[PDB]
Design an enzyme around this catalytic site. Sequence first.
Site, short mmCIF file in Angstrom:
data_model
loop_
_atom_site.label_atom_id
_atom_site.label_comp_id
_atom_site.label_asym_id
_atom_site.label_seq_id
_atom_site.Cartn_x
_atom_site.Cartn_y
_atom_site.Cartn_z
N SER A 42 0.86 -1.18 0.00
CA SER A 42 0.00 0.00 0.00
C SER A 42 0.90 1.23 0.00
CB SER A 42 -0.93 0.01 1.21
OG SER A 42 -1.68 1.21 1.25
N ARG A 43 0.97 1.92 -1.14
CA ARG A 43 1.90 3.03 -1.27
C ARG A 43 1.54 4.18 -0.34
NH1 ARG A 43 4.67 4.52 -5.37
NH2 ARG A 43 5.59 3.00 -6.81
N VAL A 44 0.27 4.32 0.03
CA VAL A 44 -0.11 5.35 0.99
C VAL A 44 0.54 5.09 2.34
CG1 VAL A 44 -2.03 6.54 2.07
CG2 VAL A 44 -2.24 5.72 -0.26
N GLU A 52 0.19 10.68 -5.96
CA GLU A 52 1.60 10.72 -5.60
C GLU A 52 2.31 11.89 -6.27
OE1 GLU A 52 3.62 7.08 -6.32
OE2 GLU A 52 2.85 6.09 -4.52
#
Lengths: 498, 466, 468, 50, 69
Positions: free
Chosen positions: A357-359, B187
Amino acid sequence: QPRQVNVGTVIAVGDGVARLSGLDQVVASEIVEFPPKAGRNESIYGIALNLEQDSVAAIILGDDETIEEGDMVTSTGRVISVPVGQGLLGRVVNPLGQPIDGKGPIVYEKTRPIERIAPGVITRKSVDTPVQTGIIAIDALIPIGRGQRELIIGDRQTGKTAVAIDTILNQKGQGMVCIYVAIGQRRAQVAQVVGTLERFGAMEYTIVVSATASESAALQYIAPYAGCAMGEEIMENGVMLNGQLVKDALIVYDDLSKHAVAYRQVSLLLRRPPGREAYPGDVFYLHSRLLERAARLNEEYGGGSLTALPVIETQANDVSAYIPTNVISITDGQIYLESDLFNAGQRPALNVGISVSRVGGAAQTRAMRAVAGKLKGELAQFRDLAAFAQFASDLDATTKAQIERGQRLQELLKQPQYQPLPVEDQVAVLYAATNNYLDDVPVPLITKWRDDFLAFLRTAHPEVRKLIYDNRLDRKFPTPEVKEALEAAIKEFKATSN
Amino acid sequence: AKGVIQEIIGVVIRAKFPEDEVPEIYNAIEIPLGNGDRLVCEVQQQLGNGVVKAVAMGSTDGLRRGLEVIDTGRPIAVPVGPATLGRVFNVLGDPIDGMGPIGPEVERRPIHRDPPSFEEQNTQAQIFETGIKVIDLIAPFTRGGKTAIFGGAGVGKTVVIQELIANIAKEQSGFSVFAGVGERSREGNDLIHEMKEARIDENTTVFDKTVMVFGQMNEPPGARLRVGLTALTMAEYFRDEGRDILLFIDNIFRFVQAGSEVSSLLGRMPSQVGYQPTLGTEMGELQERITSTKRGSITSMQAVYVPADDYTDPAPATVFSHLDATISLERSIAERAIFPAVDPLASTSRILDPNIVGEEHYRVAQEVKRVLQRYKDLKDIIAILGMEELSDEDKLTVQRARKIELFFSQPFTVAQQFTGRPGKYVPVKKTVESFARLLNGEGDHIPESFFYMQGDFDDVLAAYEA
Amino acid sequence: AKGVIQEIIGVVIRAKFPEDEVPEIYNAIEIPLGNGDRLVCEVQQQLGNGVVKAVAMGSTDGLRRGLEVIDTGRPIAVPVGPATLGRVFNVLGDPIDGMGPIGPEVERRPIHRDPPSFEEQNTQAQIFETGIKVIDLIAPFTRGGKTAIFGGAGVGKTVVIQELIANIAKEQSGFSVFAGVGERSREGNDLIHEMKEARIDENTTVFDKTVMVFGQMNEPPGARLRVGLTALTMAEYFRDEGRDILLFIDNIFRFVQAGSEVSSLLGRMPSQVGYQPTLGTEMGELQERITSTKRGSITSMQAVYVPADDYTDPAPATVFSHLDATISLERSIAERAIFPAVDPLASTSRILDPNIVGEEHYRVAQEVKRVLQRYKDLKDIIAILGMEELSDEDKLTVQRARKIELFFSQPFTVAQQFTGRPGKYVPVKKTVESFARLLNGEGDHIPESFFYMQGDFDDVLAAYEASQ
Amino acid sequence: AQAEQERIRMLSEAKSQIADLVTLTASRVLGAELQARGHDALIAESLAAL
Amino acid sequence: AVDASVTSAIELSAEQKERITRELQQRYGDVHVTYHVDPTLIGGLIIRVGDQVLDNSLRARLSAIQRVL
Ligand SMILES: Nc1ncnc2c1ncn2[C@@H]1O[C@H](COP(=O)(O)OP(=O)(O)OP(=O)(O)O)[C@@H](O)[C@H]1O
Ligand SMILES: [Mg+2]
């Protein structure tokens, strides 16, 4: 009120694709009408995709067995749009907004067009508010936040729809309007999902957009943009939910691989040049358009959010395929479900080694963030040491105890179906497990231990749950105040039972 | 110079012009929309008689088959200058930030330009002074070179970019340009804008020294294809002004993917795995503008995403054919509290040879990464032996390797207001001297946690004596 | 009406009709063909000035260009009702048995009908006992729900289907429909005839309660394409009036292959491995009609043939999402002489839920899968090193897994023709009890070879005692 | 709450039936008039309004 | 030329057919007008010329349905 509208003639109708001949001044995605005629008392709409010269190739949103060569088509000036708003909550609607559950007409006043540009570049905001899945594994190791698009990717039958339905059920009072978009899914399965949602009272805040397999490929193609438009309306204007203006939406695309198949079908029937694996060239553009509309707008633009959970089945766990890699690139996180883990007893079946999960911690409550770091570290080290655990029997007591702890955590994550755990409960259980209070419990009984502990907190000490949930946002969650009356509860439960 | 649209198939628009007024191959079209603004298409193919096939750069969900088109004569013109500094632009150069539009007094330059000639190329590679110890020791940059990042989120790639921008803006003029090519809007935007507006250096925000151009995945393939060229045009203006420029391209693989989609929609036959036939030439027309001439240099630090883990894929292969160094941020190093997660291994560079950096630099960079060449393969023997209660030299080599791994960390001037520690800028000479002394043995007799977060070996000695 | 043939490309016939009398999309047009018998084509596309592209569904290899075609004005109509019981039909609804043709008074229903809407769907299902250990334990045959077996070429899909019919068609409590969309005319039919006519239910044979529509392999692509729809139209009449229906469609993959050949001849752009672009929609149109609704229940049981041994093929991949209970037959298991050849790990079912099948059944099935999952994990270790390197508990789980794998094998009453072992019918309760006892530890001393082709655990114990 | 929703959804269904019923009876007021009296020439001119 | 088409439920007099014909001859030229009756359409101001059509006699009834719903 006489009006003059441009019309064309169907010169060639085929497998749901019609050439409309002369429809000058038609917009590039209109809704051609095909007015009712002898034998058809309704209207069959279509999308004018290819605006070629002396021909307009238009897919058909319905049964093409009734369209006949020479029929008239009236070019309605409106680009494809779906009804949106409060009236859609609790209704099953096909991607055109027409109800299919037979509970009456859809009441609405605004029709937000599908296929809209992304909400903005600077209009978004950092993802901070968590989405409480109710699954310990997801909420602790692969967090999902409001406005973050998290992919649910796995084999053909591993629990993807089950995970999505558990997430949808869990948002009972969390101020979320879940949306379940069923693309290419058999009508009986959509009926089962609707029955599950109604059984747990989760159809008072859920919109189900279903384009089943029998329905035309155009309906499945526009299936996720319908519903995405609904969520956009929810995140931009809000819907009155439980007396509170909810501006958060949660959309689940039941299967984007079937949506990609539908787009491939409509493209190949239009004789567009293929690409890789016969999919059209811009399938990444397809899914990026679909998924980039999920965002968490800043306070200036409304402060709303739209959380997307694309679901993808992978043939023989081939992650390196075309559509899986595309949507993995697009999404902000992945949740891999494996048949090997599912058969081995790990019911959520998450492959926490490769699910990311990049968050990250920004999508977790401060209590969850403070407690789950040790969880992730210990689980990763247990996965690393599984190589020695499989073979070596001469390992020291440290490694044996560490493998035991890894097994404790893994058995802790084994959650049943339709039993979500609220944030306070998961925090309490993980605090108990990561602080060595669970070491003396044998592995086969850890799930029963967790269930009994939750019964204990729900009955014996509701106040500790209220206290944990009340101050889950403070920078230092493990305050001596929360630290006491929780270790005391764990000690009391340990002393009383076993 | 006005034509009519004939066909609209997705984001590919075919327009018919008068016979003697056909637009050039890369000119703009600027279809005027009813509600005031325009849809800027880019020609890609002249064909037939007065007919041009153009890529949309926009939605094309509101266009008929008779709309007029206004040829511009020149390719996509983008504002360049000090005015376009500290602002966010899209592929067309229109500022997408909240601030006002760019004034007409600012010079507009064509997006398509030829790369510098061979005569102007530097005949000797020169190391680029970044200031980060691990970056400038193991995988040095190249003046007018390219560098790749292989790391996900949470490993501090954004912080590394911010530190590079701050260092180039402080030591030299270092105007920076950031190219968001097919990156996630969450992002790329609002986690780069905010993390760079909040980040400050000498009471001047990093965002004020950086130009951002953002073509996100939501945009049509043409936008993601030409966003890189827009960023190159902005950086090339300042390069022509003589100022060294650090240009960041986020996910150049998305630029390749946009090219592939454009070719597939344009009717070109696929090459290899569905990729465009003009892959190498398209990469050359962009990467060759990133070079160090005599008057100025554009150093590039790109980020590369490989589909799955396939490095045999044509897009990563073509990207790597134009690379001078690779930096591999690692999750394990990041989670071990060492903020610069640059893995000492798997971070190569073609400058790391005696004839450019120097004999001492190569020697010190070879002594280091040699004790780590095994990745401390001794970890397994410790794991299954309890270190065997004695490892002789291996204990010394393990201590030295751990000391070096800790020492690779360096304070961030952009994270000074977050971790509460001033940032130290370490020149390459200081790096090589410090590591030479550490390998000689001056780092011995000093325990760990004293090499954790410091700039120089002299700073470590000062901390030890205090 | 009264068009002319323009082109004859394979089984696809392009005909030109007058401007104002073009046939509809799914109309059935006919070539007189002489001899008093006509070739019934089905329209698929409309190409322009009265030109339509139709699928012959016949020989279409002795007719010329310029032949007249007569437009019937209606899609293909097939007889429905009790008159179809105990009769064998073509894709066109024409009987092929020795009995006479269906009378005009029998209702004719078009074979192209809309599937039941969302309101009509019936989600209520329960376990349908079948007497096969692996099927009734791992992937329970679901009553009122779609289920199918996926096998290669050498595995015994036909044997399993025939045994299932023999077990469950006697106590039908309703009529049944059999449709071999694509299958050998030797064992798929003309041998199921003998089996069904031999079986007797209180002086009425099972065949007296069955409607059979074949369109065997020999038939051209059109017949194999539309025979499934014909069978579905014949069964929907009985479902709509409340009768419980057992539907056995054999080799849906042949329906897909016929669609692929027809699409290739129709000029459509190929997708994936030569398949039709309209694969998902065709599968939806056929399968969504196989649904138990609020008026009646259809207990479907399909078969799917995987090309080569590729489960990633588009046809089985499309089938997988249209089923309640999935049964996967593997080549390796069959080559290990395990005739059921079902892979428990790759075979699942929706009703494998403790609230539906029983808590003990669910626990037993989950344990029988966790074992053999450990075995699949340790397969490489065993293959390259051997049993010795595993831990004691791992060893015990491994021999328990091998014993379970052997025990899933079961003799079939239809296997007497090439195997002398008499057939066995193991009730689901006995299967659950046997596997629970085996997992408890009982039977550990028994060698693995004693579990091969046995009934319940009592038979294994009796054989062990006989061999002492 | 469901009972209130059931009541209000029947009102919409009842209103929908009224709208469907009035238009069917609107065929009686003028559509049935077209049998003998509804044949009109000024309405044909209304087609040629443009 | 231009192929026009007009439909009406009422079978007006043959002269009425001519009246329809020459009121359209003022625009363009010898338009090939095609006549139908459309019994299912009880009304309709059907005037279809070229690729443009005019129609509102019963569409107003349908428009009334849209207003009430
Ligand atoms: N605790 C659990 N969590 C997840 N899945 C479970 C759990 N317990 C059982 N299951 C299985 O998950 C199934 C739910 O469907 P699932 O989510 O696996 O479908 P899917 O991945 O969408 O597959 P399909 O291709 O069949 O639609 C149940 O029928 C059961 O077999
Ligand atoms: Mg599913």
